[PDB]
């Protein structure tokens, strides 16, 4: 029950008693399976969260570990048997790079301090960007007074209905347990002094994009919601270069763009009707709403080689070389862009190693082009040519199966503008 404040703000009693009764209800509500589950969490919550992320990004046929696979159900549901009637604000201490920002917060004279140009620079780069949160999040119920090497505080509002258990081993210092599938958008910045020592604060609400995942049934749904009417409704011509580009015209005529080359059994005119159809065809049913699409890109379309030193994110030192290079960086895109509304990888590109996870806001001149018949299993979304986008963050995991090529792969987040 919800008969408390929004934010306990620093009065532990308060949230301690709140917390222990939610808690004993909660838990009695729980089967063995659920409570199993959340035992497991306390005791293994990291491999548990790395493990929500190889799963949504493996291939269709991934068996991966089936212990690990009832947690990420039951937890799911165990939470969803928590949900708060009223908001809550919660806090963490967080580091710069959750944020896509690699740049010192602290003063170089003074390490109590956040250095002023870092924290302006930071204000920027938290702005106009939803932060996915991947795998599960505990967080506690007030202003943690612990000595936090970290830079940033989280005062994080979760909206109404939000999944959000009280558990734990310390009944003194009961977590709250936050349901997957959320991100997060920053409402407010400010400097705060916690027991004489600087935090950049950061105000933000917990929000819920659309995001598929896996969730291939319900893409495809929306798909068909969305875009049937714009499939049935193409000119002839604008239907025929759409089948051409997704029968593998898609290559020459990408290429054209990019870089002007044309092959000569086409031709300029060619070339430049069929784009000219494409496009006139994506700006006809603009993305009703936001929602989340992916690209595994490969290496050219980040000035490497299959064979390129840099290209091996097996050792850190590249990974580290990579993130410096492009993070919050603005990549024009001269071509149309094929993304797909799922995170599950493609057989045809299983090894590539960047894997873009792109915000595609409402009103983008974009299409699911997967409406189209015989292209159904492709669950693809084509966007117009001649957007950009910014690299909000670059986030490594270990592809560890021999089709996906045993190897760290980069979620490249990103926001089209």
Do not use: C
Not at 68 to 90: C, F, H, Q, R
Not at 157 to 186: F, M
Not at 338 to 354: E, M
């Amino acid at each position: 029950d919800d008969n408390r404040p929004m934010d306990f703000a620093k009065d532990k009693n308060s949230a301690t008693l709140w917390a222990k009764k939610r808690k004993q209800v909660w838990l009695n509500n729980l089967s063995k399976a659920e409570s199993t589950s959340i035992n497991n969490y306390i005791k293994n919550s990291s491999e548990i969260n790395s493990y929500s992320i190889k799963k949504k990004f493996a291939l269709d046929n991934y068996e991966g570990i089936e212990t690990l696979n009832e947690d990420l159900k039951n937890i799911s549901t165990a939470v969803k048997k928590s949900m708060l009637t009223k908001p809550l604000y919660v806090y963490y201490y967080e580091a710069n790079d959750k944020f896509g920002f690699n740049q010192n917060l602290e003063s170089s004279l003074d390490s109590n301090i956040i250095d002023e140009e870092a924290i302006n620079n930071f204000a920027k780069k938290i702005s106009d960007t939803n932060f996915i949160q991947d795998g599960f999040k505990d967080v506690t119920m007030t202003e943690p007074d612990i000595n936090s090497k970290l830079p940033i505080l989280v005062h994080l509002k979760l909206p109404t209905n939000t999944p959000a258990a009280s558990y734990g081993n310390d009944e003194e210092n009961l977590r709250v347990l936050i349901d997957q599938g959320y991100s997060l958008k920053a409402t407010g910045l400010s400097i705060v002094t916690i027991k004489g020592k600087q935090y950049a604060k950061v105000d933000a609400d917990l929000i819920k994009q659309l995001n598929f995942e896996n969730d291939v049934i319900s893409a495809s749904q929306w798909g068909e919601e969305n875009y049937a009417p714009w499939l049935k409704e193409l000119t002839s011509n604008e239907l025929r270069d759409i089948n051409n580009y997704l029968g593998g015209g898609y290559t020459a005529i990408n290429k054209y763009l990019l870089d002007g080359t044309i092959g000569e059994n086409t031709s300029k005119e060619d070339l430049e009707e069929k784009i000219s159809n494409i496009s006139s065809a994506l700006k006809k049913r603009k993305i009703p709403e936001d929602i989340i699409t992916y690209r595994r890109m490969g290496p050219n379309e980040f000035g490497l080689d299959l064979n390129s030193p840099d290209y091996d994110f097996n050792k850190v030192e590249n990974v580290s070389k990579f993130k410096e290079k492009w993070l919050g960086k603005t990549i024009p895109v001269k071509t149309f862009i094929s993304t797909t509304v799922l995170s599950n990888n493609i057989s045809a590109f299983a090894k590539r190693k960047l894997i873009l996870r792109l915000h595609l806001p409402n009103g983008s001149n974009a299409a699911y082009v997967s409406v189209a018949e015989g292209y159904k299993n492709e669950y693809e979304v084509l966007i117009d040519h001649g957007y950009s986008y910014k690299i909000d963050n670059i986030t490594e995991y270990y592809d560890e199966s021999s089709l996906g090529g045993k190897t760290n792969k980069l979620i490249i987040d990103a926001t089209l503008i």
